[PDB]
């Protein structure tokens, strides 16, 4: 089966995985991580 290494969810089918990525949970976690990386910017 599949897992989202970011949101830490489990999925039975790949259809379920894709529907995950297009959903509130995945999108907001993705936005948070984008922010966090911006914070991480530097003779």
């Amino acid at each position: 089966s599949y897992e989202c290494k970011l949101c830490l969810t489990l999925h039975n089918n790949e259809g379920s995985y894709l529907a995950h990525t297009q959903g509130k949970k995945h999108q907001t976690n993705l936005a948070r991580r984008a922010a966090k990386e911006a914070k991480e910017a530097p003779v």
């Binding site: 089918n13 790949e14 259809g15 379920s16 894709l18 529907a19 297009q22």
Partner: protein
């Protein structure tokens, strides 16, 4: 009906196979035919279809047309740019908000 899961599998299939091989795309889904896969893509899933709200230009159009060609929605629709089901529901909508 159609579920988010079928829809995303369709989107992916189409984006790999192309829009004339509906029979193998229909082989990829369970409980789905090529007739139905095609209908769904060309009714809702196609990224050309726009799901916004009606500019009042679009609504004055809709009203003028739906009076000039009454009951002919597959003919009205392309002249304004949304599918026939959207045109039709939104037209009944204006009618009852006006009634």
């Amino acid at each position: 009906v159609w579920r988010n899961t079928e829809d995303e599998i369709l989107k992916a299939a189409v984006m790999k196979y192309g829009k004339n091989q509906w029979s193998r795309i229909a082989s990829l889904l369970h409980r789905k035919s090529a007739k139905q896969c095609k209908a769904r893509w060309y009714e809702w899933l196609d990224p050309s279809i726009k799901k916004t709200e009606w500019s009042r230009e679009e609504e004055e159009k809709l009203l003028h047309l739906a009076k000039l060609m009454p009951t002919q929605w597959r003919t009205i629709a392309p002249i304004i740019g949304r599918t026939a089901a959207q045109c039709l529901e939104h037209y009944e909508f204006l009618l009852d908000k006006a009634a």
